[PDB]
């Protein structure tokens, strides 16, 4: 028989990344992940089509890729932009139709965390392929959030403009981050976003956060977000 086993879960934050590995010994194309807490039965996260497609639950399709390795007899789920509902935790066995379930994985767990100035944060250091989530409190009060936008910048080189987001809710994004980049306002609490999911060695830079207000442009200090492996 088949004996499954699955690592490389943790704790995490908001947005945040995890890699979730599995392996096996004793055809590796039929294995989803599923997902368990405890107070609702568990569910399945990604299985597959019998042509051979990856179908994801629609409540995270564009979060978590479901990659594998035939060479090492290895799976993977790489998962960024978590959500604390992702709490839970992760199996292996299979998930195409009309195949044998194999024996039961113990699981890896996953847990997710939660004079005018700007105040940003989030900032950390990542693998390649990882997604933080970057934010930007105002520090007013609630006296004036306006429209915003952030830009980077790598020590001794020219600043860049990477996503803004003015006050009718539109977005416009660098072709440096086209497609991975996500800015969201969430106005509730008068602070503004920006999620970042499949960083690169060169995204590795210190990221600030410009709202232009009165008269003069203001800044903050701006975190770090480092991403070399």
């Known amino acids: 028989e088949v004996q499954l086993v699955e690592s490389g879960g943790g704790l995490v934050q908001a947005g945040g990344s995890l890699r979730l590995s599995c392996t096996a010994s004793g055809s590796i194309n039929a294995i989803g992940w599923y997902r368990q807490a405890p107070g609702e039965q568990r569910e399945l996260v990604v299985g597959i089509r019998d042509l051979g497609s990856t179908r994801y639950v629609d409540s995270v399709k564009g979060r978590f890729t479901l990659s594998r390795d035939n060479a090492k007899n290895t799976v993977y789920l790489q998962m960024n932009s978590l959500k604390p509902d992702d709490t839970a935790v992760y199996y292996c066995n299979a998930a195409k139709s009309g195949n044998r379930l194999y024996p039961w994985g113990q699981g890896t767990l996953v847990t997710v965390s939660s004079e005018v100035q700007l105040v940003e944060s989030g900032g950390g250091l990542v693998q390649p392929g990882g997604s933080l989530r970057l934010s930007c409190a105002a520090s007013?009060?609630?006296?004036?959030?306006?429209?915003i936008g952030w830009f980077r910048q790598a020590p001794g080189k020219q600043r860049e403009l990477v996503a803004t987001?003015?006050?009718?809710?539109?977005?416009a994004y660098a072709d440096s981050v086209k497609g991975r980049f996500t800015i969201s306002r969430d106005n509730a609490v008068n602070t503004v976003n920006l999620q970042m999911n499949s960083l690169k060695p060169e995204d590795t830079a210190t990221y600030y956060c410009?709202?232009?207000?009165?008269?003069?442009?203001?800044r903050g200090q701006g975190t770090l977000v480092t991403v070399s492996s």
């Open positions: 410009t709202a232009r207000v009165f008269g003069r442009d203001i």
């Open positions: 987001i003015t006050a009718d809710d539109t977005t």
């Open positions: 007013t009060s609630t006296f004036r959030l306006n429209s």
